Amino acid sequence: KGYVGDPSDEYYMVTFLSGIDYWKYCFEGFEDAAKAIGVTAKYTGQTDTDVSGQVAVLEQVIAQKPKGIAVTAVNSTALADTINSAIEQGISVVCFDSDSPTSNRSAYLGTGNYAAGQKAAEFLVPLVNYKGKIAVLYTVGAENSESRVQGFEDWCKQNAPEVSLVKVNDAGDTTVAADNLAAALQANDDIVGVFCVDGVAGTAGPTAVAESKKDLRVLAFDVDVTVLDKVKSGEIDGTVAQGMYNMGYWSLMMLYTEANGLSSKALPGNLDTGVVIVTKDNVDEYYP
């Protein structure tokens, strides 16, 4: 038995908010991984963010007895126990997008958030010519947001010494975010750029900049249709797209390799699927 697989070996991509466009980019790689090893790729998940619901839908995925599940967990600790029972009954499970690291999953395939911040700084800082202040709008307390800010700030400290940052909390709310960004622009007249780290920031960010009536360089995150339209119209300069296709593509490679055993050692633990800066040159490639 090599990589020529059987369409009878079922492999699930278990998600939350199954209907949103984000998972379409991921499953397109998951169902492209299965386009050559030729195994069965199914796409299921809970339609909402409910933790109780996600535990229930993966128990039914486990009930269908698959050789391997690529699952993104709603929480870092909620799917802890339900995924261990799966492994105890001969199921190979990796995690993509959102990881359950305290679990016994074999590998994680997702964005290196610290590295993602460095790449975002590699693009935004030259736009402001390596000088001035850059406002960073992020959710204080969110692990990935803090890692993106740290990578951003660290890149600036090593490569753009004349650049300083002002940290602005969005508090996971668009109304509070736009207010905090408005006050930041009022107190700091040397602000030349705005990095929107999360979704909430990608919404209240441009609004507080437009009301400011200041011409600043804005970089958002992810590929929401609202953000993509701002990139095409020229309201913002770009957005950071996660390697969603890579998350689905390489998840089945590790899952199948573990399912049968075509590698003598355990799989690599972490794959950084990277980020791509979406500008006017490539924004058409990311529209749903």
Author numbering: 32 to 319
From the publication, what sentences describe this entry?
Clostridium thermocellum has extensive potential in lignocellulose biorefineries as an environmentally prominent, thermophilic, cellulolytic bacterium. Previously, five putative sugar transporters, denoted A to D and L and belonging to the ABC transport systems group, were identified in the genome of C. thermocellum, and the solute-binding lipoproteins (SBP) of these ABC transporters were shown to bind different dextrins by isothermal titration calorimetry (ITC) assays. To gain insight into the structural mechanism of the transporter specificities, 11 crystal structures, both alone and in complex with appropriate saccharides, were solved for all 5 putative sugar-binding proteins, thus providing detailed specific interactions between the proteins and the corresponding saccharides. Combined genetic, biophysical, and structural studies have provided solid evidence that transporter A and transporter B are the major glucose and cellodextrin transporters, respectively, among the five potential sugar transporters in C. thermocellum.
Similar to the typical SBP fold, all of the Cbps adopted two-domain structures connected by three hinge regions, with the buried ligand-binding site between the two domains. The crystal structures of both unliganded and glucose-liganded CbpA were determined to 2.10 and 1.85 Å resolution, respectively. According to the “Venus-flytrap” mechanism, i.e., ligand binding causes a dramatic conformational change of two-domain SBPs from an open to a closed state. Hence, the structure of unliganded CbpA assumes an open conformation, while CbpA in complex with glucose adopts a closed-conformation, resulting in approximately 37° rigid-body rotation with respect to the unliganded CbpA structure. Furthermore, the binding pocket of CbpA is distinctly small for the accommodation of a monosaccharide, and no additional space appears available for the binding of larger cellodextrins in CbpA, thus explaining the functional specificity of transporter A. The ITC experiments showed that among all of the tested substrates, only CbpA binds to glucose, with a dissociation constant (KD) of 240 μM. In agreement with the ITC data, NMR titrations showed that CbpA binds glucose but not cellobiose or cellotriose.
